[PDB]
Amino acid sequence: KRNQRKVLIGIVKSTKNAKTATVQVESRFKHPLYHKSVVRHKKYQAHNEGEVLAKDGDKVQIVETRPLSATKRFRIAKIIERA
Amino acid sequence: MKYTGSIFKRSRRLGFSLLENNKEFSKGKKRKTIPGQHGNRFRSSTMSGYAQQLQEKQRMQYMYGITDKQFRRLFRLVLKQRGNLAVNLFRVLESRLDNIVYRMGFAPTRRSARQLVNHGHVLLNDRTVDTPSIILNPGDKVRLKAKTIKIPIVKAASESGVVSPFVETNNKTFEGTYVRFPERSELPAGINESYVVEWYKRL
Amino acid sequence: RMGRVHYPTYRIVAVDSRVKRDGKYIALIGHLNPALKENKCKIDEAVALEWLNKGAKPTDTVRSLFSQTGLWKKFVESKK
Amino acid sequence: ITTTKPIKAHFDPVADLLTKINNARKAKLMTVTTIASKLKIAILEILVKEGYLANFQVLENKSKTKRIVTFNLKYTQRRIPSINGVKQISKPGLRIYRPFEKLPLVLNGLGIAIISTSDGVMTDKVARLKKIGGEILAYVW
Amino acid sequence: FEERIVKLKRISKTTKGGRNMRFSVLVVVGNRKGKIGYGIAKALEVPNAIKKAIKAAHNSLHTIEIHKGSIYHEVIGRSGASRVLLKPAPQGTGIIAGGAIRAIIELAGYSDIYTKNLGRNTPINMIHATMDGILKQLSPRRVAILRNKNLNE
Amino acid sequence: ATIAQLIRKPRKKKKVKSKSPALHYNLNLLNKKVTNVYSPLKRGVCTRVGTMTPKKPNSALRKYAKVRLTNGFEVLTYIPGEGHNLQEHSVTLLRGGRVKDLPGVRYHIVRGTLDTVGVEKRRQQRSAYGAKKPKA
RNA sequence: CAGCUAGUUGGUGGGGUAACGGCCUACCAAGGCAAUGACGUGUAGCUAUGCUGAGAAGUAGAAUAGCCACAAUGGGACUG
RNA sequence: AUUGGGCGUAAAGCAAGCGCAGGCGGAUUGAAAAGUCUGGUGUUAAAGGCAGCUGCUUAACAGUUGUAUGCAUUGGAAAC
RNA sequence: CAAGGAUAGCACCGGUGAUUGGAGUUAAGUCGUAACAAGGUACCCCUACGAGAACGUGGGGGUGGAUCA
């Protein structure tokens, strides 16, 4: 049973609740009219499965899952630690 | 107008004729000035490029007895294929049935040929033809529906005419065949076709 | 029918018996012209097998035409 | 070789070299110098191998702490520069990247545009020969 | 050798005890084979102004080159803030232009060309800009001699 | 301008107000609601018939009519044609247009309508100024 | 149109949906979204496309086709 | 007015300044390749635009043969 | 749970409505000459007072002012 989903890489920003974080992703994409690569940033709420621990100010890669609730539609899958 | 019923006025105003010259037979004064009454010293009020373009457009159109909207339709179909469209317009215009009918020596005028064709006096590809708006293809014949071969006008004018070099006919059986495309230097014409090409801005 | 009045048309089209004419479908098997019938029909002869192998049997009015073409003989091989 | 009155990098390679070229052909100046960089070296290389430019040199004092390039312009005894016109298409605020069949040509093929795809800058005809499109940077003629 | 009018105007200087009304005529001369020029004149009546304009235009005659019966490279000519944009026309398409530009291009012996006008149209300024742009024309031999390569590309 | 200010402030097109917004607005019963249909002609009722003086470069005695409409706005119009058949209280057809002699009159009472007859004679112009064919 | 929001936000247990989920419930906890334009207001069926323009684009989204919407107005539920 | 406009006297450079965010940026080398360039694959329905062909006396038309931007995966290129 | 009613007053947008404000449109209306020249007190800009009006003046600023330049 192959298990695949969309994956997005972003930077975690905040955490106030229990084992849940809010991550800011950035995307530089062409403007629809002038073809200027504008940066848009967006917030996503994620939860910790148990093999991870959310610390603010880190790059993460998240995948889809069953919708936990509103805005919680991804989980922190892989962390790339600072080098 | 598709059937003007008066061509001498156009000939006098334009100084041209569908035939070589037969629209001045001294039935009174033989004057090459404009018809009507506008003074024999006046020519026109506006003589720009628009005026001469329109004049040549009317000359070319009324030399064939065609309406303007069908001319625009023909130009639209001409834009499909490409090449030297200046002479291609002439080649396609001459491919109309009545044009080749005159080129066959069948009837002196396109109007007479149209009158013959519409009333069901022509056979082509075993199908009755009632309109000259047929895009002739290379390698097609035309019969005469021998019941109507008894028309005095065509019988008399078969020999007394001129046969174009790009068409052939066995006039003894009164059937002709399209040989090849017409040429500019073989037919009598002095029309500035470039004016015709440039004038129509619908496309 | 589709096409032109007094000149009908019906494409041989792969579809399941759920919706109306000229709508959602799966594949375009071919076309038949009833305006001139001389035992000839636009048929791919390959995709129709896939269409038949996934249910959704064609319109009932084409069975004789497919038998004339020779599709039933190779289709009934499964039940052999 | 000696040049006092120290020079300053304008903002970037392409704009600096192009404005220097335009001002030189307006003032008929032989030698024009600017700050050294890989991109400017490539631009000078292509513009001198395309037969629009005179001698070009790259020099340093002892290290890359002071490294500059300089170049002359092709001329004629009748006081006429070989080049006639120039216009930059790529700007620091906007860079347009185009496919193969969207490759522009100047004059009608007379001018040469400078296109870099993955191996430095090159002429339009060679890029079309290798069927690689990419980004243009300037039109010269 | 054609000498067609372009735009005739009424002008008048104002002076104590009466103003002097006169006619101003703009002309363009072209053999249709390469010698082209243009001129202005003013006079009390038609014949003197026409003769003056013909003489002035004939004096300023200069030649022009033909590239396959077309203008083989783009040109944006400017004079008095009136841009004229000329680009090659492939043979078999005809020649398109506006009245003054029509006369200018046909008088220079040019088969066809695609033209456009930017800015407020003005006859004399437009004629000046068009002639400046046409006389700016380049040539493959020019680029060959100013380059190292001796070919078109 | 520059790219960035285009990004933050995209340019917006400008449109000229139509020369007859009254011919485009309509009302209805069962409710009060103004809607736009951009009609090319409407129906009206004349409430005043008289004359008014034109501006500087011409002086004459024209026929102008105040006309109310089934919709909200009510406006003026100019009566063309030799003579007239408009006394008061008549239903007629209003069409877009403009007359350059009076302030704000940009409407034409097209003759040959439900009530007004035309300049029975004008054979040169018979599409307008509704009249029969040229006399046999 | 400067702040909107309270099942709104999240953990736990149960219920329930055709399944996953404040979808509902009991306790506990207090953020989410926003100046990169939420929220409020005005207008609007969307899409392939029709038309114009060489094009970037502008305009309207009639036939025709796909989707959702509603069936005098508003609530519910049975049936399969 | 990205294509394709301006701001001295015609409309238009804020009264001037400090600056948050944003946008834009000195040279050399490395790494991947975030876009870009460039292949394969699957997806952009039908009808419709465009090109050829065919039957409608014939054009109008209809059918057919192809074409059409964009998206995602996958391998190359590392000049920007 | 619960459409719906009833009461009560809070928000938002519209129609209408005596009667007055200002603007535009009208062929040398009356008032006075304000401005255009050194326009007969140089002009203009900001602000304050006052008078039928045109504006006059106070304070600050400029020449898009004439002579001398």
Ligand SMILES: CN[C@@H]1[C@H](O)[C@H](NC)[C@H]2O[C@@]3(O)C(=O)C[C@@H](C)O[C@H]3O[C@@H]2[C@H]1O
């Ligand atoms: C006061 N003498 C004047 C003075 O000589 C003028 N020239 C400067 C002179 O000018 C004229 O000769 C003219 O040219 C025209 C006429 C209006 O006044 C004429 O008479 C004008 C004379 O009356």
